[PDB]
Symmetry: D2
Subunit: 264 residues, 4 copies
């Protein structure tokens, strides 16, 4: 009776479906797959990437950056929503091949440094290559690259290091306030009395209110379905996108229903 | 045409076949599986573990340590042959549950710190949970635990951090010199002109001579077949075990044959 | 005109004045100096150390542990108030010589990992030897060693990783609730509009309320004067010690006065 | 009788004497101080810095890079001779302010990661802010930036991670082979029977032969006096510079004399 074999982290086929860059605003492009968000922001002094997707998406991200006229050495900074394998997957490889720096808060930094292993809820099941954070950022800290200011908003819950990123772009000269908010889901998490996260419920609740108050004209999420984006349809991709209030309210109704079933 | 799914590191069934502790010498026990070596050394001041096997072997190692009357908090030190997933697999988990320290040279430390990712030859294919080395040891340095002195002998090749560990035990009061030598194989490695390892051939050759000169009355290897051990047969397990000279000579004949075919 | 020389972190003479172990409760001893707290908790399964003081206090701590009959290999765990040089100074050296593990939250972990350098307020002026955290702990998480449960309470402010530690001891069989609360001072900090800490004032205020609600029969602080301890007088050391309310209220009155002068 | 105060690492005044960039070859400039080498290599794709000097030299290095028309974000890579405080001092700060990556071997990486603390010979006496290596390089590995190839040559001794860097530049179109060799000194080291470095003498001897065989038309050293440079005299700075043979032979005669006095 041999011990079990290791099990690969395997996701939906659409999470790994490459797509050509889809323009969000004047400087902002979606360059990930159909169902995983990877945002490229092009400035006069370099490029900023927010999330990278799965581990095996590293080559596709660089191919899309080339299509945008962004050489590898032009990627200055990597920002993250949270350091799970399906959002921070290729960060280690991207650092080696681009010379970019990574900016994260302490919680995302320690999780990223151990490649997602020893997860509070998933154990060692979703491990990925580790990377180091070069800059630690605090709640409300501004990160400026090429004139574009990125403000971090901590929203703990899905991970302790979960972070929303806001910045103002333009739509043909007219300013548009973009908010890239992290996941508000708890897929199979023990919510009440979790010895690895004793104040988990207080963090989620406080984060629901955080997402509501975000300065937002256009919302995006790591999983585009969470905010009702549809990257595959091109132009009408943002047609049915939720507001910040709708997104945090829908997430909280699922949180409470899950919290109530957990007591049952 | 979606990008490929991740692939799990899957090994032979016998590498994951648990076995009861097999006594090597008065203080030395094999507590791994049939085809993967994990050596436990019991002293008056604590226990020393050399290698741990696969990632999923952590529970079995602790079960065997209990059978030997070794509580988790009695494991003082973890030593490694090399930091590949099939030898350093459970080190991270074992540190959390035992309070042990890990001693390795700088090369094994940096590879262990990134969980085997970015391997010189295997890329990110054999990743495992990362761990940190608490003590860096130099070539020829002695590590003493409970009166038992462990001398490290660097033998780079299979990995840059590959290490042989020697110590003197007893066999009913009569001293027996044990040498635990690391792998001398190069499974699918590019040997000549490897941009990630330009002096690889000089390291292997120098390591063949290193293994020959080791003070050794009884030889063990991470893979027991390399030194012709057979853990499954219990008593006669060491019956056909190779000497140090036989082991390094057989490995070098395979190295040269492989080096010659590589030029062809 | 040569560039300036490096400047050593030099403290009051009394911060470096060794003292013999002073008993706080049945299992709890002060083993630091007259003006720097280092708490030793002796259990049936090992010892716990809370804070270590200055970098150069490592030998004195081990000398005092011996006086208590605690060998180096009996130190199981190191807990911290915050990772400044005058409280986490000897942690790196203590890990090497005792085999202890270190438990801290993510913020204290990242600061401890870079030896206090790049401090939010002090720059590189108070650097000390770096150490790694072996276990990351969350707010409200319980750490049990030898039956004694240690609960962490995050109180950000003096550092982002600032932590209060509570545990129940006994005083000749009668239980006594001990709270070791971290510093609530801001010596020379920019409080309002700090680009390295935009929500600093919200953290301090929330931490003042945290210290008030702590389950506490006897309060201790990293600097004993903050809670009106006097380690030098032996028996009457805790005679004039403040309550939790008195300590947080005195700290907040100094915070507000400082905040008001900062606007002036 | 209080414990001693901490002691600052204080060096000769000339080690901290700023100077204007001194041209070595077409692409290579000395931008450090009079007695500490910091080499800037300007390419079409960015800049390479070899060594940085003391911790407090970070601002001066950036001032000199500006004089050369090199903005902070143009610094692509930092290479090191060895990770002592007087050569790797400002590396941490330079990474934060330039976005450069650092390339070092495993030994220099682990020492740099702990800020020079726990030195094999100097203990914690010469600590500096820690930094992380982004790329691990092997002996003989080539690092190419902007067409300029940098080959590493390991020369252990002064530190285990000591490294010589060679590259071909031009002198008005005519190629000039530059070798930047690390220190070959052992100031106060225990040479024979050093428990922290049992094979120290074998490393130095092998390194003396390594420095002799280096492809070199013009030699430089971290301390310019070691190779008889005189940065202060401008034009005639390289007038009396030693060859590689003269440098390794003079170092070995001092090594043997020191080794012989150590036995006395
Ligand atoms: C780790 O990545 C997530 N989970 C998974 O991939 C798998 C899971 O947990 O099921 C999983 C976990 C552990 C394994 O060993 C294997 C698989 C996660 O973080 O929860 C990902 N991330 C998010 C998020 O970020 O919100 C959602 C959104 S919910 C959703 N998305 N599609 N359907 N649903 C209901 C869940 O999937
Ligand atoms: C990483 O672990 C080893 N390789 C493997 O497990 C697999 C491989 O390389 O084939 C592998 C590699 C990458 C993958 O993505 C998937 C699988 C390795 O380090 O080479 C292991 N370790 C040793 C050693 O330590 O010598 C031998 C001994 S040779 C031997 N053993 N049995 N048959 N043979 C001929 C090879 O297997
Ligand atoms: C870093 O350590 C503290 N500061 C200092 O040692 C020095 C300082 O800041 O002045 C300092 C700072 C930077 C330097 O380059 C040199 C020196 C600190 O963390 O603030 C220490 N810790 C606490 C605390 O933990 O609360 C108090 C309590 S206030 C107090 N204590 N005595 N008198 N006062 C008014 C201040 O001292
Ligand atoms: C750490 O930096 C070096 N040593 C020192 O700065 C001091 C020392 O050791 O004396 C020292 C050490 C520890 C302390 O707590 C305080 C000071 C070193 O690495 O040896 C530096 N580096 C080199 C080198 O790199 O070769 C030489 C060249 S020999 C030379 N240079 N000038 N005169 N001499 C004879 C020595 O100085
Ligand atoms: Zn997730
Ligand atoms: Zn996800
Ligand atoms: Zn291997
Ligand atoms: Zn193997
Ligand atoms: Zn402090
Ligand atoms: Zn303090
Ligand atoms: Zn040096
Ligand atoms: Zn030096």
């Amino acid at each position: 009776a041999p011990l079990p074999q290791l099990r690969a982290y395997t996701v939906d086929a659409s999470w790994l479906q490459p797509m050509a860059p889809l323009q969000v605003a004047d400087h902002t492009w979606q360059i990930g797959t159909e169902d995983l968000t990877a945002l490229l922001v092009q400035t006069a002094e370099g490029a900023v990437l927010l999330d990278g997707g799965m581990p095996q998406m590293a080559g596709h991200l660089l191919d899309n950056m080339k299509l945008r006229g962004v050489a590898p050495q032009d990627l200055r900074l990597i920002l993250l929503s949270h350091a799970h394998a399906d959002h921070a997957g290729p960060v280690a490889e991207l650092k080696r091949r681009t010379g970019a720096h990574v900016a994260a808060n302490a919680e995302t930094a320690v999780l990223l440094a151990r490649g997602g292993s020893n997860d509070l809820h998933f154990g060692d099941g979703i491990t990925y290559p580790p990377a180091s954070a070069d800059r630690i950022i605090m709640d409300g800290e501004v990160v400026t690259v090429g004139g574009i200011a990125f403000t971090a908003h901590f929203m703990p819950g899905h991970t302790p290091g979960s972070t929303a990123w806001t910045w103002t772009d333009t739509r043909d000269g007219k300013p548009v306030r973009i908010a890239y908010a992290d996941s508000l889901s708890a897929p199979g998490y023990q919510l009440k009395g979790n010895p690895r996260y004793p104040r988990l419920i207080e963090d989620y609740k406080r984060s629901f209110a955080t997402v509501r108050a975000l300065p937002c004209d256009l919302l995006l999420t790591p999983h585009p379905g969470a905010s009702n984006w549809n990257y595959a349809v091109g132009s009408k991709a943002s047609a049915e996108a939720l507001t910040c209030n709708a997104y945090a309210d829908a997430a909280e109704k699922k949180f409470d229903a899950q919290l109530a079933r957990e007591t049952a």
